[PDB]
Amino acid sequence: SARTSITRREYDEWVREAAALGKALRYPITEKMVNDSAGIVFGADQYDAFKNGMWSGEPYEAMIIFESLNEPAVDGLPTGAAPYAEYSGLCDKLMIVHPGKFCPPHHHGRKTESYEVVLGEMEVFYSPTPSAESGVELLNFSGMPVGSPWPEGVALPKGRESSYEKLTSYVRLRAGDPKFVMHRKHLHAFRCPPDSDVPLVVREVSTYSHEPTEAAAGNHAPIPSWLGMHDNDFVSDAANTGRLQTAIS
Amino acid sequence: SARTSITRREYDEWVREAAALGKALRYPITEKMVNDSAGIVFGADQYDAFKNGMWSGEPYEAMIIFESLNEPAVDGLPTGAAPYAEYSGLCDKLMIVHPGKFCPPHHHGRKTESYEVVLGEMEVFYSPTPSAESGVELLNFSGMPVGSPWPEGVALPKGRESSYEKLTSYVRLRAGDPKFVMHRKHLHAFRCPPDSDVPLVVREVSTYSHEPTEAAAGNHAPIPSWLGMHDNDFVSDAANTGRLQTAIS
Amino acid sequence: SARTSITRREYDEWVREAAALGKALRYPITEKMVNDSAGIVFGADQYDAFKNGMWSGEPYEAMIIFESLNEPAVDGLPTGAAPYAEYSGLCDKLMIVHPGKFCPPHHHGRKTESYEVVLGEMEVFYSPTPSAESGVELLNFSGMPVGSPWPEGVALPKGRESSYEKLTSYVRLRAGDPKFVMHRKHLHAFRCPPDSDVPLVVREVSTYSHEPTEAAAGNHAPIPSWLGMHDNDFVSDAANTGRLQTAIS
Amino acid sequence: SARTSITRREYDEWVREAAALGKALRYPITEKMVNDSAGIVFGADQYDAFKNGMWSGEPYEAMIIFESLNEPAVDGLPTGAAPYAEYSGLCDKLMIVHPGKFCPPHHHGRKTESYEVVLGEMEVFYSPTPSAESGVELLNFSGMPVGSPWPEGVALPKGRESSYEKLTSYVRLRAGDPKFVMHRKHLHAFRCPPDSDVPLVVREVSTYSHEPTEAAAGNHAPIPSWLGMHDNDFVSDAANTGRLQTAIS
Ligand SMILES: O=C(CO)[C@@H](O)[C@@H](O)CO
Ligand SMILES: O=C(CO)[C@@H](O)[C@@H](O)CO
Ligand SMILES: O=C(CO)[C@@H](O)[C@@H](O)CO
Ligand SMILES: O=C(CO)[C@@H](O)[C@@H](O)CO
Ligand SMILES: OC[C@@]1(O)OC[C@H](O)[C@@H]1O
Ligand SMILES: OC[C@@]1(O)OC[C@H](O)[C@@H]1O
Ligand SMILES: OC[C@@]1(O)OC[C@H](O)[C@@H]1O
Ligand SMILES: OC[C@@]1(O)OC[C@H](O)[C@@H]1O
Ligand SMILES: OC[C@@]1(O)OC[C@H](O)[C@@H]1O
Ligand SMILES: OC[C@@]1(O)OC[C@H](O)[C@@H]1O
Ligand SMILES: OC[C@@]1(O)OC[C@H](O)[C@@H]1O
Ligand SMILES: OC[C@@]1(O)OC[C@H](O)[C@@H]1O
Ligand SMILES: OC[C@@]1(O)OC[C@H](O)[C@@H]1O
Ligand SMILES: OC[C@@]1(O)OC[C@H](O)[C@@H]1O
Ligand SMILES: OC[C@@]1(O)OC[C@H](O)[C@@H]1O
Ligand SMILES: OC[C@@]1(O)OC[C@H](O)[C@@H]1O
Numbered sequence A, B, C, D: 001s002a003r004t005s006i007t008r009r010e011y012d013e014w015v016r017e018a019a020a021l022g023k024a025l026r027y028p029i030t031e032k033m034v035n036d037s038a039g040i041v042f043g044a045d046q047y048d049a050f051k052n053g054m055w056s057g058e059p060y061e062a063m064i065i066f067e068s069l070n071e072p073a074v075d076g077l078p079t080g081a082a083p084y085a086e087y088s089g090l091c092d093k094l095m096i097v098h099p100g101k102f103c104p105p106h107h108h109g110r111k112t113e114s115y116e117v118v119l120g121e122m123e124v125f126y127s128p129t130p131s132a133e134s135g136v137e138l139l140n141f142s143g144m145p146v147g148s149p150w151p152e153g154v155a156l157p158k159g160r161e162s163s164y165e166k167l168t169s170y171v172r173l174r175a176g177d178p179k180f181v182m183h184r185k186h187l188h189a190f191r192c193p194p195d196s197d198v199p200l201v202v203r204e205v206s207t208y209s210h211e212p213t214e215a216a217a218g219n220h221a222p223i224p225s226w227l228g229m230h231d232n233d234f235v236s237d238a239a240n241t242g243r244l245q246t247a248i249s
């Protein structure tokens, strides 16, 4: 009886309720943001999250993201920065994760992000060590803080436990905390505690997000190379493809 | 009786009340953000705003800014982007402007910003035309929208009316509106309507802010050139210096 | 295929999401408030609201109510007021109504209520004329305002349209409006507009609520007569019984 | 240099900022609520609170109250309840108390209240023992909980320390806590902790408030006796009169 898609009813209720929660928290959600790309399920085997529902507390990789801003910030740049513009830009989005669910392990080669918890608490799992890029020297300034070891008993999604292996550092973020930075090239993932009485709601402020999603299919590229560029590298293969399309029946 | 400074009492009450308002609106204001640099008065002649107070509705150039994030985002960048890093980075801050007061005319050579109104309404004045930079070619993608002509009867600060001359385009932003982008190299200014029952509260999400302020004096520079760099160019000279220091008695 | 109950999953998701929305809006929802009595479906034939779900926009009589306060306020009263205490007391609750759904036609003999819209907009239907009580004289002071006629095209629940007949006055309430009073002995009902992007969330502040609900079964009565007293009189019979118990499968 | 009044500027800034804070927290504050009666200073000697200001942390008895509802709830009552109506009714208001300031010791003969902390934390001081009323028997049901002893080092207003003597029970309330009931005939007072980074903001939901205030001078009485009735009994005489009028210069 393994689910392989989400019904139109389950999708709309999931996304509409989330938008309402976001609006209650004063996030500027416009109509075009509430679309068939907002609800993300990372892989066919993750649709089983809708067997018992988003309030079961079971570990699955699915989440909602409402993108209010994804600006290239290319205008006004000296032409010499053209090849480096993809590392800049401005992206603002509201992320909603239900109890026990995860934004799965992945890293970005160009995108650096920051987190601001609005509601609930955020458990971030990450590698304090950045990845390298064969043949190219990289700059360094602050690097990532080491953080703490994982707490006991973190239930991971079935069949994807090994994907969290390298994300050894842990940090629990709460509303009102200082902004937390996740530098590019660092593996990261996060979940909403399973016992949370509310969905985790976090605002991400980061550099440009290169994601050829369904709701993105059709946009114009500010610079040639950008077109089709996918700056997401999920440890789990099923996650990389799932990210770009949701199966709604 | 022209004021040339703000008393410790006026400053603390101004800044503390603003922080409380920000907290009520769920902005993550930490203790280090509530400092002697948060309250900005753009020039000695602007201290007269405290003759009748922040609720008089009189046109003066003063505002409060609580910076929660100003990340260089240099880590993980290929060394070749070093000279262009100053155009990137991530800056998040809450800006509070009282009735009739202004964030004065200025432009940034490197910083691109975006606005999200949280409380009240924001009246933005700007030049749809970007400035040029002698000897260097610049990229273009979306440019700035033209906007509308100024509404009738906008009271400008005394002795600084000519500084708003080139900012011919006008746009009134409200809570819930789409994010509004202010590209680098564009002159811009904004105020809270004089008849507003509440201070204007807006969240700015932009690229790195190069501002050698008092509360900034002492930070480490990620890249040599950055040290001491001031990416603010106010049309009014008194505004450029005032920005970097508040006179508290 | 007519539904006659709501599944445990549908109930929990409905109520849990609503509690989260309430919490986001700063309403003090404690654990004991999130129970099997919070989600109300007014009659077996109204369970069909869960055929297409709470976001279908279809007209059904169901709602969520989180009661934070229901205080008798009998302590300190002169004994002579004993027979009149049931008209006083203090009740505070958060009511959540989804698009197109209704809090059905009914009146209270003792309870006077007031409304404060927190999110969305509230459409109130009521009789400006109070009901009488055979054999007893009643006091008068302000009475109810007449209001406006119903707007065109209000979809009512199937088979219950006649129950709204006498509720001729209409008023649409919004967040920030003056408190709206619904005097006891006045027929009233309300819904969330079908095109609302968010569930209607309203805070009711009223006198004591005499409702022998399931989650109420077991409380102590401050005064003999109060025990078992049901101060709700729904025009629709199915509504009176449904109110006191939800069928969860 | 002892202050004996508050300047128009100090008053407006105090009240306007508070209204903005209330609005940010979604309390329905209308224009008529922002008047010359909202800011309360309990006695001529308490105006010294404005010597160093509302952010000094000094112990003074002053506060802001925005009343959104004060409904007699007399309509629909059987005539026999006329003499007991004054114990009922509905009153909703937002109370704002700055760091270290107090809502001074007092009790009500008819009014029962409840508290809901919206921002900050509330320290309530009260007598678990109700007062008696010569010649009249009173009802009892739940009475007041005993609470805890006062914490160490509570700074009381100068020259009014003895007024807090009988208020031996203490309870610290926070946002999200269960509603707290203060039965009529119980002495009570409260303050915002002196080290609070934000003003204390609390919503009071109670029975009718009989207060012949300045902004009240002119209202119609639903029942003869009510006219001019003052249901406030402050332990400090200067507090009883101060409550009804603010000296603005
Ligand atoms: O359109 C939006 C906001 O809905 C984003 O996807 C970006 O295009 C904003 O620049
Ligand atoms: O410290 C803060 C936030 O208070 C900012 O000034 C930046 O340093 C954050 O990166
Ligand atoms: O317990 C509560 C709040 O959850 C109400 O039902 C009343 O009992 C409060 O007095
Ligand atoms: O007018 C108001 C709300 O501003 C109160 O004083 C009461 O009159 C409401 O019934
Ligand atoms: O409007 C979309 C929807 O929620 O409305 C009815 C159906 O259930 C579908 O899922
Ligand atoms: O395409 C719009 C929409 O139907 O898609 C997802 C969301 O539910 C919204 O209602
Ligand atoms: O009141 C909530 C809000 O500010 O947040 C989003 C929605 O657009 C609305 O403007
Ligand atoms: O609204 C946010 C979003 O889901 O919509 C388009 C893009 O895919 C982004 O993830
Ligand atoms: O880490 C957060 C995030 O990058 O992960 C998935 C989605 O792209 C979102 O922006
Ligand atoms: O040291 C290399 C590595 O294994 O460590 C960190 C990064 O995730 C990369 O995979
Ligand atoms: O105990 C935590 C942990 O060791 O278990 C799985 C994950 O890889 C993480 O490193
Ligand atoms: O704490 C700072 C301050 O507000 O406290 C007292 C004095 O007025 C000064 O302005
Ligand atoms: O330096 C800290 C501080 O005194 O400076 C400004 C703000 O009022 C805060 O209290
Ligand atoms: O409740 C308001 C809040 O979320 O906003 C800022 C403060 O830190 C607090 O956490
Ligand atoms: O807290 C924000 C701020 O005022 O503090 C330091 C810097 O000057 C910035 O403008
Ligand atoms: O336009 C907004 C702003 O750039 O103007 C002044 C301050 O630097 C703030 O960040």
Ligand SMILES: OC[C@@]1(O)OC[C@H](O)[C@@H]1O
Pocket (backbone or CB within 6 Å): B127, B129, B130, B131, B132, B166, B186, B187
């Ligand atoms: O055309 C050049 C200019 O005058 O127009 C726009 C920019 O402000 C610059 O000053």
Ligand SMILES: OC[C@@]1(O)OC[C@H](O)[C@@H]1O
Pocket (backbone or CB within 6 Å): B150, B164, B165, B166, B167, B168
């Ligand atoms: O009327 C608006 C305006 O023309 O007046 C002053 C400012 O320069 C602006 O362009």
Ligand SMILES: OC[C@@]1(O)OC[C@H](O)[C@@H]1O
Pocket (backbone or CB within 6 Å): A051, A052, A053, A055, A056, A057, C008, C009, C010, C012, C013
């Ligand atoms: O916890 C209750 C529940 O939501 O969890 C799993 C099952 O679906 C049930 O409805």
Ligand SMILES: OC[C@@]1(O)OC[C@H](O)[C@@H]1O
Pocket (backbone or CB within 6 Å): C011, C012, C013, C015, C016, C034, C035, C036
């Ligand atoms: O009885 C508690 C509960 O299961 O009942 C309704 C709500 O969903 C809550 O989880």
Ligand SMILES: OC[C@@]1(O)OC[C@H](O)[C@@H]1O
Pocket (backbone or CB within 6 Å): C022, C023, C024, C025, C026, C027, C028, C029, D175, D176, D177
């Ligand atoms: O932050 C939201 C909140 O104030 O509202 C309800 C919950 O208890 C929490 O305290």
Ligand SMILES: OC[C@@]1(O)OC[C@H](O)[C@@H]1O
Pocket (backbone or CB within 6 Å): C032, C033, C034, C035, C037, C038, C039, C065, C066, C067, C068, C213, C214, C215, C216
């Ligand atoms: O929590 C609110 C409530 O649903 O719980 C008990 C009572 O029935 C009331 O209606």
Ligand SMILES: OC[C@@]1(O)OC[C@H](O)[C@@H]1O
Pocket (backbone or CB within 6 Å): C065, C103, C113, C188, C204, C209, C232
């Ligand atoms: O009119 C609102 C209400 O009285 O109707 C049903 C429930 O009792 C709620 O309190």
Ligand SMILES: OC[C@@]1(O)OC[C@H](O)[C@@H]1O
Pocket (backbone or CB within 6 Å): C127, C129, C130, C131, C132, C166, C186, C187
């Ligand atoms: O006049 C009597 C009546 O029909 O009118 C109002 C009330 O609802 C009652 O039913």
Ligand SMILES: OC[C@@]1(O)OC[C@H](O)[C@@H]1O
Pocket (backbone or CB within 6 Å): C150, C164, C165, C166, C167, C168
């Ligand atoms: O058109 C509105 C109306 O006449 O139609 C049904 C309901 O009785 C109401 O009075």
Ligand SMILES: OC[C@@]1(O)OC[C@H](O)[C@@H]1O
Pocket (backbone or CB within 6 Å): B051, B052, B053, B055, B056, B057, D008, D009, D010, D012, D013
């Ligand atoms: O509008 C009232 C006021 O604030 O405006 C100017 C003067 O200071 C007075 O206090």
Ligand SMILES: OC[C@@]1(O)OC[C@H](O)[C@@H]1O
Pocket (backbone or CB within 6 Å): D011, D012, D013, D015, D016, D034, D035, D036
């Ligand atoms: O009378 C109205 C008013 O002036 O009185 C107090 C408040 O400041 C408001 O502005």
Ligand SMILES: OC[C@@]1(O)OC[C@H](O)[C@@H]1O
Pocket (backbone or CB within 6 Å): C175, C176, C177, D022, D023, D024, D025, D026, D027, D028, D029
């Ligand atoms: O957005 C804040 C608000 O809801 O609270 C009071 C003001 O009227 C406004 O409607």
Ligand SMILES: OC[C@@]1(O)OC[C@H](O)[C@@H]1O
Pocket (backbone or CB within 6 Å): D032, D033, D034, D035, D037, D038, D039, D065, D066, D067, D068, D213, D214, D215, D216
């Ligand atoms: O707005 C609330 C209030 O101050 O205004 C009138 C009455 O005095 C009450 O205390």
Ligand SMILES: OC[C@@]1(O)OC[C@H](O)[C@@H]1O
Pocket (backbone or CB within 6 Å): D065, D103, D113, D188, D204, D209, D232
């Ligand atoms: O205890 C709160 C209160 O009764 O004390 C003063 C004012 O009357 C307010 O309503």
Ligand SMILES: OC[C@@]1(O)OC[C@H](O)[C@@H]1O
Pocket (backbone or CB within 6 Å): D127, D129, D130, D131, D132, D166, D186, D187
């Ligand atoms: O026992 C009588 C008394 O002293 O105790 C409680 C009440 O305050 C009254 O003053």
Ligand SMILES: OC[C@@]1(O)OC[C@H](O)[C@@H]1O
Pocket (backbone or CB within 6 Å): D150, D164, D165, D166, D167, D168
């Ligand atoms: O220590 C607390 C206390 O004993 O001191 C003063 C007040 O009367 C209170 O009872």
